[PDB]
Amino acid sequence: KTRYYLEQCIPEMDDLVEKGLFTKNEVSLIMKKRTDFEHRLNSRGSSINDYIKYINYESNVNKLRAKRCKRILQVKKTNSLSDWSIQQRIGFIYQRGTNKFPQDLKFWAMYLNYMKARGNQTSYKKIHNIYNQLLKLHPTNVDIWISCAKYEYEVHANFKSCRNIFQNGLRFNPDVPKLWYEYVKFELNFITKLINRRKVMGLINGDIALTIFDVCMKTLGKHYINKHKGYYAISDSKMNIELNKETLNYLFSESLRYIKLFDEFLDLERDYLINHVLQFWKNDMYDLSLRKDLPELYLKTVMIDITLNIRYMPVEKLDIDQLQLSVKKYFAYISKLDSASVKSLKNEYRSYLQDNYLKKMNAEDDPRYKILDLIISKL
């Protein structure tokens, strides 16, 4: 049906000769270059590269017409079919290429980027149809779910729709830590903008994330348990204890990543948010106690807690009392720890104090340099 496609180009080109932008010979050349391509697209062995070349070739022809419009007609826009035909045509290649080769995610992205650029020409409803179609074809690709969520939270700032994307994405892909990580990121991004708007509102006159974090664990653990067993359960008790361990070590890593994530956001009470993560790991999980079986994780858990009260004050605002509270915490944990752990914790706590506060301090001017040095000598 190549001829039907060729005949569709006739009305646009009758316009181009009529406006005088393109002479019948240059007209003839454009049709010959087109005609070779639809045969390429409609013929057996057509590859996605062929569609890209037309989109590039048709893209160029738009540039020539725009320049000749100002050069010859001396008009920004001539009210005729030529103005929107090429953009309309370039789109039509995109649907056919996407329909013909749904696999190639690169071509899809070119499709979205092209029409996203021409927001006026292409309504945002037309974005959602393709995303609905694309997401429908690849529900398991996390990158797409974040793509539409990111698009509608920045260009449109529709948190409700953006929230639904994560909810439906996590429904399809609950085993991907990345999607949870981004969904928590969006959740806090909504909060920080809200409080900042509240601050702006005053000038001119979060727990929800923690729930995501908590549920984020439970699914990831179940899925990580589901993997490494395969179809069946594991008969050996020792191996089951291991499978519990790789989960706890695995689950410990995502909890640590979210701890890094909290630091980014200054407005939120990171100490309160972090403490909830600390209170989370105090609870025994999967019949395993962190203190007895995995001391190394427990030491990192303690190291955060002892430095929790002293983590976020600058060097200028370090008060002696909270430092005293920190060292009292450190001594309390020593009495309940074995000798090997105490030495490791002593080294880590000593390094933390030296790097964060002492090295950034003038020894001669500030009296609290001497208190800090005495504490570390005593640690």
């Binding site: 995610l105 690169k106 992205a109 070119m110 979205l112 980027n113 690709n141 990158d143 797409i144 974040i146 793509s147 969520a149 990111k150 939270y153 981004e182 990121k185 969006f186 991004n189």
Partner: peptide, 18 residues
């Protein structure tokens, strides 16, 4: 939120013969 999708845009049955 970070997405790489936008960045990605740019014979067994034969017997022996005598």
């Amino acid at each position: 939120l970070e997405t790489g999708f936008d960045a990605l845009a740019n014979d067994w049955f034969t017997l022996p013969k005598p």
